[PDB]
Structure 1
Amino acid sequence: QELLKDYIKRQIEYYFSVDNLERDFFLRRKMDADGFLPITLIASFHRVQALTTDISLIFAALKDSKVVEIVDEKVRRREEPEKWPLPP
């Protein structure tokens, strides 16, 4: 599953990129004030669900990332996550 994990990792890192975040008003509305989102919400996005429905592989893919941080069931951008949340 190593190649599939790499595709999932890079797809989710795109969502958490600055270039995406500047326009991704839905993602930012769903963040809590600390920048965290449910990993299961990310799992529902079309390009992730195309690759897998195995939540364990999604967690494994993201543990490897230098872009995002996992706390329990939630994920956020590591760099300055508090700048991005928006009102629901």
Structure 2
Amino acid sequence: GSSGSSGAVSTEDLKECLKKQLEFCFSRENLSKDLYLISQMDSDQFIPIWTVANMEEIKKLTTDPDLILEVLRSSPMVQVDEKGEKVRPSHKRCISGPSSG
């Protein structure tokens, strides 16, 4: 098989991991599993960027707000306000399946 799972360590692997964290953290199962995340959410089902940017995993993976904001706004699962103050999990399916980008 394979010794482990991941290989070398480059910016590509770091960026990919960060994307999975935000996507997974905003996931339906993760959202309902993270009682804290839900408690932090807003009235309009919006989560503060500070909370995510303060995350240990997110901090160890990235320490830049611009980079993190881009990842969130770059990914569909989540959407960052044009301004960049609050982000919410895209509660609407845009793609069908085999179609993406």
2:99 maps to what in 1? none
Q: Check if 1:47 corresponds to 2:57.
A: yes
Q: Which runs of 5+ in 1 are unaligned?
A: 81-88
C-alpha separation between the residues in 2 aligned to 1:78 and 1:5?
A: 20
TM-score by length of 1: 0.80
Size of the aligned set, in residue pairs, is: 80
Q: Report the structure number with the largest CA radius of gyration.
A: 2
Is the CA contact (8 Å cut-off) linking 1:5 and 1:58 kept in structure 2?
no
Higher helix share: 1
Q: Which runs of 4+ in 1 moved over 6 A?
A: none
Q: How high is the sequence identity, in percent, across the aligned residues?
A: 40
Is the CA contact (8 Å cut-off) linking 1:38 and 1:74 kept in structure 2?
yes
C-alpha separation between the residues in 1 aligned to 2:19 and 2:44?
A: 21
Is the CA contact (8 Å cut-off) linking 1:6 and 1:61 kept in structure 2?
no
Higher RCO by CA contacts (8 Å cutoff, separation 6 or greater): 1
C-alpha separation between the residues in 2 aligned to 1:73 and 1:28?
A: 17
- SS in structure 2 of the partner of residue 53 of structure 1: coil
